[PDB]
Design a protein around this nucleic acid. Structure first.
Ligand SMILES: [Cl-]
Ligand code: NA
Ligand code: NA
Ligand code: NA
Ligand code: NA
Lengths: 216, 460
DNA sequence: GGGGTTTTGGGG
DNA sequence: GGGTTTTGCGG
DNA sequence: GGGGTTTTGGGG
C-alpha cells in the first residue's frame, strides 16, 4: 500500500499512458498539502514528496476573490486544500524544469484551492523531489522503454544483418563505428519523440506573473 | 606551529590550537543558510581512539571537528576513512561530554588532508601518483606549508593509522544500524555495507545495490559527481541515511545533501572482513524474472574474470567518438553496459546459421545441414544511459564464427529448426533481454567498424 | 592582533 | 555541532 | 578597506 498520495497518483498516470480518466477514481478526492515554498518556485508536499502545482488563470482569480486578504506567493509554510484538480502529461526540457525527468513531466492542474490559513500539520520526513525518486524515475524509464520498443519494432525491419564476411576475414578491412547507428524511429530531430500518449494542453500561469499581480 | 595531541589539548585556554589526526567519519560539506557551509567530522589519534574497555565492548572513542566556511570549496571532502587531516587555529570546548574542536576557515583557520595510503581517492580514480608523502592532496586557502619537523609527525601518525585500522573495527557496531532493522529507526541512521552493484540509472545518477552483514539488500541513488569513488565489491560507510517508506517494489535508502559515502583505507580490518564475509546476492533479480514489470534492474550477464580490471565505455563514445578521440582509437577491445531494445533476426530459429569458412558466407538451416559449421549470427540493437534521449539504437553483434561470444547463451550453436531444447532456451533468453530493466554488461572487440561480443555469458 | 592587501593610517 | 541549500542531478 | 573579532585604535 502506497503512502505517498502524490507518488501513487503520478505513477498511475504514467502507467496509464497519461490517460487521467483511466486512473483510479477513489484518488480524485481533495488534496490537503503543506506548502514548502512559494517563490521563486511554488512547491507543495503530501508528507513524503514535493511537487509543483500549476494554477490556471481561473484558479488564481477564484482564490484572490474568495480570499482578498491572502497572497499566494506568501503561502510558504502554510497548508492549502485543492478541491478541484487534474493530472496531465506534458513534454518538457528536463534541463530547465527540475520537477521533471527524461524530458517528461506529470502536471498537477489546480482549478480551485482554498488556503486553510494557520493549520499546523503533523511532523513528517523532509520532502524530496518526486522526480528524483528511484522508483518513480524507473517508472518513467519503463514508459519510455515501452514507447521506444514499439517505435523500433515498427521502424526497424527486414533483418538487415551485417554480412558475416565484413567481420570475419577482415584483416585488410577498416570501418567506421557510426555504421552501427540505427534510427529508432521516424523522429524529426536528434531526440526520440515517437510517443503515443496525447500531450495534455491547458493554459497555465507562471509563478512569476502572479508575483507581479500581487506586488508588481 | 606547535601540534598538540587530541587528549592533551587545553580545554581552558580557549586559544587557537593545532593538531594532526585521523578522520574516521565526516559529513559532506553542506550549506545551512544563504551564506554558511559546514562539515562535521570524527577524528582520532594515539591518545584518543577507544572507549574505556571492560564494558565498553571495544567501542571507539573520538573527538569531533566542526569546520565553518562561507564557500563550499573551502571545506574538505572526505571520501575515505583513515586518511589524515592537519588543522590550524582550532578552538576546543566540551559539547555534551565530548571534546569538540571548532575551526572557522572563513576567518583564520585552515586544514590540510594527507593520504594515509599511497594514493588519495582522487588519485586512484585517475591512476595518478602522489607528489610526495609530505604533499597534501587537498587543503584550504591558496597555500599550504609543511615544515621539516612535521614529517616525523605525519609519517608516524600514518603508521599508527594502519595499525589502528588493521587491529580494530574503527567503525564499531554502535556507529551504524543493520539494514534489516532500518525500518525501525525514527530518523536517519548510518550504514556499513558492501557495494554489490553500481547501476547507471541516468546521465548523473548511480543506483548502488548494497548488502550488509545482516544479509539485507538495499538500493540507493548516488550522484556521479558527488561520489565518483563508488566501486562494486568495495565496502563503504554511509553517513546519514533514511528508510524510504514510499517504496514498496524495492528496499530504498534516502540520502541528503549532507549524507556521505566513505570507503576505507587498504589496511581496514572491517572492510577486509566484510569484502569476504558478504557475498553477492541475486535473490532480488531471480525474483524479478517472474514479474511482468520489474522496477529492479537486472544485469543478465557477467564478463570474463580477466576483464574485471577494465574500465567501461559508454555507447556515446563507442559509436560517436571511437573514430575521433585519440585514446579510443588506440583501443580495439572495450567493455560496456546497455539494454537490448530489439534482436535480429526476429525469428529466433534463424539465430543459428550454417557457415562456410571458404566463402565467408552463412545461410539458413531451414533446408538441412548442407550449409556448414553452425554459428551464431545475432544482431543486438541496444541503447544506454549516455544515449538514452537521442533517436538512435546501436548495433552490437554476436557472430561466433571465430569463437568470440560462442558461450553467450550457455547454449552451443545448433540447428534451432530441429533442436527444440536449444530453441526454447534461446527463446526464453530473447524475452529476458528485451524486457524492461534487463541490462547487459559485456566486453566487445572492434572489427571493421563493428563491435562483437566476447568473453561474456548470461547468468540467468 | 593580525591577513592580505595597499588601505600604507584608520571603520564598524 | 547528528545537519536541510539552489548550484533545484556535489552543495 | 573591510572580516572577523574584540584589538573597540592601530602593525607591518
Ligand atoms: Cl575498424
Ligand atoms: Na587592517
Ligand atoms: Na592594511
Ligand atoms: Na582591523
Ligand atoms: Na577590529
Amino acid at each position: 500500500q502506497q503512502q505517498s498520495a502524490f507518488k501513487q497518483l503520478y505513477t498511475e498516470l504514467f502507467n496509464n499512458e497519461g490517460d487521467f480518466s483511466k486512473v483510479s477514481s477513489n484518488l480524485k478526492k481533495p488534496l490537503k498539502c503543506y506548502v514548502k515554498e512559494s517563490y521563486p518556485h511554488f512547491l507543495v508536499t503530501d508528507g513524503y514528496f514535493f511537487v509543483a502545482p500549476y494554477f490556471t488563470k481561473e484558479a488564481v482569480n477564484e482564490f484572490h476573490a474568495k480570499f482578498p486578504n491572502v497572497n499566494i506567493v506568501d503561502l510558504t509554510d502554510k497548508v492549502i486544500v485543492i478541491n478541484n484538480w487534474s493530472l496531465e502529461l506534458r513534454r518538457v526540457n528536463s534541463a530547465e524544469v527540475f520537477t521533471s525527468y527524461a524530458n517528461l513531466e506529470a502536471r498537477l492542474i489546480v482549478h480551485s484551492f482554498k488556503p486553510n490559513l494557520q493549520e499546523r500539520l503533523n511532523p513528517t520526513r523532509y520532502p524530496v523531489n518526486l522526480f528524483r525518486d528511484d522508483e518513480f524515475k524507473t517508472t518513467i524509464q519503463h514508459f519510455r522503454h515501452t514507447a521506444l520498443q514499439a517505435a523500433i519494432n515498427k521502424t526497424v525491419k527486414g533483418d538487415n544483418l551485417v554480412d558475416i564476411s565484413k567481420v570475419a576475414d577482415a584483416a585488410g578491412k577498416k570501418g567506421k563505428v557510426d555504421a552501427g547507428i540505427v534510427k529508432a524511429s521516424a523522429s524529426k530531430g536528434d531526440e526520440f519523440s515517437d510517443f503515443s500518449f496525447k500531450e495534455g494542453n491547458t493554459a497555465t500561469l507562471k509563478i512569476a506573473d502572479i508575483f507581479v499581480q500581487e506586488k508588481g | 606551529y606547535e601540534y598538540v595531541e587530541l587528549a592533551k589539548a587545553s580545554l581552558t585556554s580557549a586559544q587557537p590550537q593545532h593538531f594532526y589526526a585521523v578522520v574516521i567519519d565526516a559529513t559532506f560539506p553542506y550549506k545551512t543558510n544563504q551564506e554558511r557551509y559546514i562539515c562535521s567530522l570524527k577524528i582520532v589519534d594515539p591518545t584518543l581512539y577507544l572507549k574505556q574497555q571492560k564494558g565498553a565492548g571495544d567501542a571507539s572513542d573520538y573527538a569531533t571537528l566542526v569546520l565553518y566556511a562561507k564557500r563550499f570549496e573551502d571545506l574538505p571532502i572526505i571520501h575515505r576513512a583513515g586518511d589524515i587531516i592537519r588543522v590550524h587555529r582550532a578552538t576546543l570546548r566540551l559539547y555534551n561530554g565530548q571534546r569538540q574542536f571548532n575551526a572557522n576557515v572563513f576567518y583564520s583557520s585552515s586544514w590540510a588532508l594527507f593520504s594515509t595510503d599511497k594514493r588519495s581517492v582522487t588519485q586512484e580514480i585517475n591512476n595518478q601518483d602522489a607528489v610526495s608523502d609530505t604533499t597534501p592532496f587537498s587543503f584550504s586557502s591558496k597555500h599550504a606549508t609543511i615544515e621539516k619537523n612535521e614529517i616525523s609527525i605525519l609519517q608516524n601518525l600514518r603508521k599508527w593509522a594502519n595499525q589502528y585500522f588493521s587491529s580494530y573495527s574503527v567503525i564499531s557496531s554502535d556507529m551504524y544500524t543493520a539494514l534489516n532493522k532500518a525500518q525501525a529507526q525514527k530518523g536517519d541512521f548510518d550504514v556499513v555495507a558492501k557495494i554489490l552493484q553500481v547501476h547507471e540509472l541516468d546521465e548523473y545518477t548511480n543506483e548502488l545495490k548494497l548488502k550488509d552483514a545482516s544479509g539485507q539488500v538495499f538500493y540507493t541513488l548516488s550522484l556521479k559527481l558527488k561520489f565518483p569513488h563508488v566501486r562494486t565489491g568495495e565496502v563503504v560507510r554511509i553517513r546519514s541515511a533514511t528508510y524510504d517508506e514510499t517504496s514498496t517494489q524495492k528496499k530504498v535508502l534516502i540520502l541528503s545533501h549532507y549524507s556521505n559515502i566513505i570507503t576505507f583505507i587498504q589496511s581496514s580490518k572491517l572492510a577486509k572482513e566484510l569484502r569476504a564475509k558478504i557475498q553477492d546476492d541475486h535473490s532480488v533479480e531471480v525474483a524479478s524474472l517472474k514479474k511482468n514489470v520489474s522496477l529492479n534492474a537486472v544485469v543478465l550477464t557477467e564478463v570474463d574474470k580477466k576483464h574485471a580490471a577494465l574500465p567501461s565505455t559508454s555507447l556515446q563514445d563507442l559509436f560517436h567518438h571511437a573514430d575521433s578521440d585519440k585514446e579510443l582509437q588506440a583501443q580495439d577491445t572495450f567493455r560496456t553496459q546497455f539494454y537490448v531494445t530489439k534482436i535480429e533476426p526476429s525469428d529466433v530459429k534463424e539465430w543459428v546459421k550454417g557457415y562456410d569458412r571458404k566463402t565467408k558466407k552463412s545461410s539458413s538451416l531451414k533446408g538441412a545441414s548442407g550449409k556448414g559449421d553452425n554459428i551464431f549470427q545475432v544482431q543486438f540493437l541496444v541503447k544506454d544511459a549516455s544515449t538514452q534521449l537521442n533517436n538512435n539504437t546501436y548495433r552490437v553483434l554476436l557472430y561466433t564464427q571465430d569463437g568470440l561470444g560462442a558461450n553467450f547463451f550457455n547454449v552451443k550453436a545448433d540447428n534451432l529448426h530441429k533442436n527444440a531444447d536449444a530453441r526454447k532456451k534461446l527463446e526464453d533468453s530473447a524475452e529476458l533481454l528485451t524486457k524492461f530493466n534487463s541490462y547487459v554488461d559485456a566486453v566487445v572487440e572492434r572489427r571493421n567498424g563493428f563491435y562483437l561480443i566476447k568473453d561474456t555469458k548470461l547468468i540467468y
